[PDB]
Chains A and B, each alone.
Chain A
Amino acid sequence: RSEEMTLAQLFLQSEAAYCCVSELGELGKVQFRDLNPDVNVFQRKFVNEVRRCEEMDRKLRFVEKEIRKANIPIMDTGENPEVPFPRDMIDLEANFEKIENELKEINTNQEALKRNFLELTELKFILFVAGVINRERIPTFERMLWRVCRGNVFLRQAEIENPLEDPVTGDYVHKSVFIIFFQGDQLKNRVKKICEGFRASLYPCPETPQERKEMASGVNTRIDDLQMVLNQTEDHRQRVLQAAAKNIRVWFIKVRKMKAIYHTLNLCNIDVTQKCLIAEVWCPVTDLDSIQFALRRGTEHSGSTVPSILNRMQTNQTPPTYNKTNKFTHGFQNIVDAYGIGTYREINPAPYTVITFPFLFAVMFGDFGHGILMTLFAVWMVLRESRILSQKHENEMFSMVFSGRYIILLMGLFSIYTGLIYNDCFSKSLNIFGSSWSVRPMFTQGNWTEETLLGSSVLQLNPAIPGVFGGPYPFGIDPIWNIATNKLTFLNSFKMKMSVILGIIHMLFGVSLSLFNHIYFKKPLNIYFGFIPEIIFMSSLFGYLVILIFYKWTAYDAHSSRNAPSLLIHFINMFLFSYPESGNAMLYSGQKGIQCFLIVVAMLCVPWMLLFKPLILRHQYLRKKFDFGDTMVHQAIHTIEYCLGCISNTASYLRLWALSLAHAQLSEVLWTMVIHIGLHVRSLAGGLGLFFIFAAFATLTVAILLIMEGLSAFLHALRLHWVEFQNKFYTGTGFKFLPFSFE
Chain B
Amino acid sequence: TGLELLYLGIFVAFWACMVVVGICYTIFDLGFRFDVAWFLTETSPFMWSNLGIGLAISLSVVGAAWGIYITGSSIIGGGVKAPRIKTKNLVSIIFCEAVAIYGIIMAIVISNMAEPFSATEPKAIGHRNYHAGYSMFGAGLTVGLSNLFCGVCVGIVGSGAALADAQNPSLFVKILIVEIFGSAIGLFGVIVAILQTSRVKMG
B98 within 8 A of A: yes
B201 within 8 A of A: yes
B185 within 8 A of A: no
Quick one: given A637-B177, A640-B180, A641-B180, are A651 and B102 in contact (CB under 8 Å)? yes
A648 within 8 A of B: yes
Q: Specify which chain A residues have a CB less than 8 angstroms from the CB of B87 in the assembled complex.
A: 338-340
CA distance A340 to B86 in the complex (A): 11
Q: Specify which chain B residues have a CB less than 8 angstroms from the CB of A216 in the assembled complex.
A: none
Q: Specify which chain B residues have a CB less than 8 angstroms from the CB of A339 in the assembled complex.
A: 87
B129 within 8 A of A: no
Task: Identify which of residues 324-373 in chain A touch chain B, using a CB-to-CB cut-off of 8 Å.
Answer: 338-340
Rounded to whole Å, the gap between the CB of A654 and the closest CB of chain B is 7
B194 touches A572 (CB 8 A): yes
Q: Specify which chain B residues have a CB less than 8 angstroms from the CB of A338 in the assembled complex.
A: 87
CA distance A640 to B201 in the complex (A): 36
Interface residues in A, total, Cβ within 8 A: 18
Q: Specify which chain A residues have a CB less than 8 angstroms from the CB of B198 in the assembled complex.
A: 572, 576, 578
Q: Specify which chain B residues have a CB less than 8 angstroms from the CB of A644 in the assembled complex.
A: 180, 183, 187
Rounded to whole Å, the gap between the CB of B188 and the closest CB of chain A is 13
B201 touches A583 (CB 8 A): yes
Rounded to whole Å, the gap between the CB of A574 and the closest CB of chain B is 12
Q: Specify which chain B residues have a CB less than 8 angstroms from the CB of A723 in the assembled complex.
A: 94
CA distance A361 to B180 in the complex (A): 30
A651 touches B98 (CB 8 A): yes
Q: Specify which chain B residues have a CB less than 8 angstroms from the CB of A583 in the assembled complex.
A: 201
CA distance A339 to B90 in the complex (A): 11
Q: Specify which chain A residues have a CB less than 8 angstroms from the CB of B47 in the assembled complex.
A: none
B195 within 8 A of A: yes
CA distance A652 to B194 in the complex (A): 19
B183 touches A652 (CB 8 A): no
B178 within 8 A of A: no
A652 touches B105 (CB 8 A): no
Q: Which size class do B's interface residues fall under?
A: 10 to 19
Q: Between A and B, how many residue pairs show CB distances below 8 Å?
A: 33
Say whether chain B's binding surface is mostly helix, strand, loop, or mixed: helix
A568 within 8 A of B: yes
B156 within 8 A of A: no
CA distance A640 to B183 in the complex (A): 12
B51 within 8 A of A: no
Quick one: given A568-B109, A723-B94, are A652 and B195 in contact (CB under 8 Å)? no
B125 within 8 A of A: no
A654 touches B105 (CB 8 A): yes
Q: Specify which chain B residues have a CB less than 8 angstroms from the CB of A648 in the assembled complex.
A: 98, 101
Task: Identify which of residues 160-180 in chain B touch chain A, using a CB-to-CB cut-off of 8 Å.
Answer: 177, 180
Rounded to whole Å, the gap between the CB of A131 and the closest CB of chain B is 45
B202 within 8 A of A: no
Contact residue among B94, B101, B180, B194 (Cβ-Cβ distance under 8 Å from A651): B101
Q: Specify which chain A residues have a CB less than 8 angstroms from the CB of B104 in the assembled complex.
A: 654, 658
CA distance A233 to B97 in the complex (A): 69
Rounded to whole Å, the gap between the CB of A153 and the closest CB of chain B is 46
CA distance A568 to B94 in the complex (A): 25
A654 touches B101 (CB 8 A): yes
Rounded to whole Å, the gap between the CB of A561 and the closest CB of chain B is 15
B201 touches A651 (CB 8 A): no
CA distance A698 to B188 in the complex (A): 49
Rounded to whole Å, the gap between the CB of B177 and the closest CB of chain A is 7
**Binary B-proximity of A101-133 (CB < 8 A = 1, otherwise 0):** 000000000000000000000000000000000
Task: Identify which of residues 632-679 in chain A touch chain B, using a CB-to-CB cut-off of 8 Å.
Answer: 637, 640-641, 644, 648, 651-652, 654, 658
Smallest CB gap from B173: residue in A: A637
Q: Specify which chain B residues have a CB less than 8 angstroms from the CB of A641 in the assembled complex.
A: 180
CA distance A713 to B105 in the complex (A): 21
Smallest CB gap from A339: residue in B: B87
Rounded to whole Å, the gap between the CB of B75 and the closest CB of chain A is 15
CA distance A652 to B99 in the complex (A): 10
Q: Specify which chain B residues have a CB less than 8 angstroms from the CB of A640 in the assembled complex.
A: 180
Rounded to whole Å, the gap between the CB of B184 and the closest CB of chain A is 9
Task: Identify which of residues 140-160 in chain A touch chain B, using a CB-to-CB cut-off of 8 Å.
Answer: none
**Binary A-proximity of B188-203 (CB < 8 A = 1, otherwise 0):** 0000001100100100
Smallest CB gap from A724: residue in B: B94
Rounded to whole Å, the gap between the CB of B4 and the closest CB of chain A is 38
CA distance A388 to B104 in the complex (A): 46
CA distance A640 to B180 in the complex (A): 9
B180 touches A576 (CB 8 A): no
CA distance A583 to B202 in the complex (A): 12
Q: Specify which chain A residues have a CB less than 8 angstroms from the CB of B97 in the assembled complex.
A: 652
Quick one: given A568-B109, A572-B194, A578-B198, are A652 and B180 in contact (CB under 8 Å)? no
Smallest CB gap from A658: residue in B: B104
Rounded to whole Å, the gap between the CB of A30 and the closest CB of chain B is 26
Rounded to whole Å, the gap between the CB of B42 and the closest CB of chain A is 30
Smallest CB gap from B184: residue in A: A644
Q: Specify which chain A residues have a CB less than 8 angstroms from the CB of B194 in the assembled complex.
A: 572, 576
CA distance A576 to B102 in the complex (A): 17
Ranked nearest first, the 6 interchain pairs of A and B with the lowest CB-CB distance are: A651-B101, A339-B87, A648-B98, A652-B101, A651-B105, A652-B98
Query: What are 23 of the A-B contact pairs (CB < 8 Å)?
Result: A338-B87, A340-B87, A568-B109, A572-B194, A572-B198, A576-B194, A576-B195, A576-B198, A578-B198, A583-B201, A637-B177, A640-B180, A644-B183, A644-B187, A648-B98, A648-B101, A651-B101, A651-B102, A652-B97, A652-B98, A654-B101, A654-B104, A654-B105
Given contacts A572-B109, A652-B98, 5 further A-B contacts (CB under 8 A): A340-B87, A637-B180, A648-B101, A651-B105, A652-B97
Q: Contact residues of B with A, CB < 8 Å?
A: 87, 94, 97-98, 101-102, 104-105, 109, 177, 180, 183, 187, 194-195, 198, 201
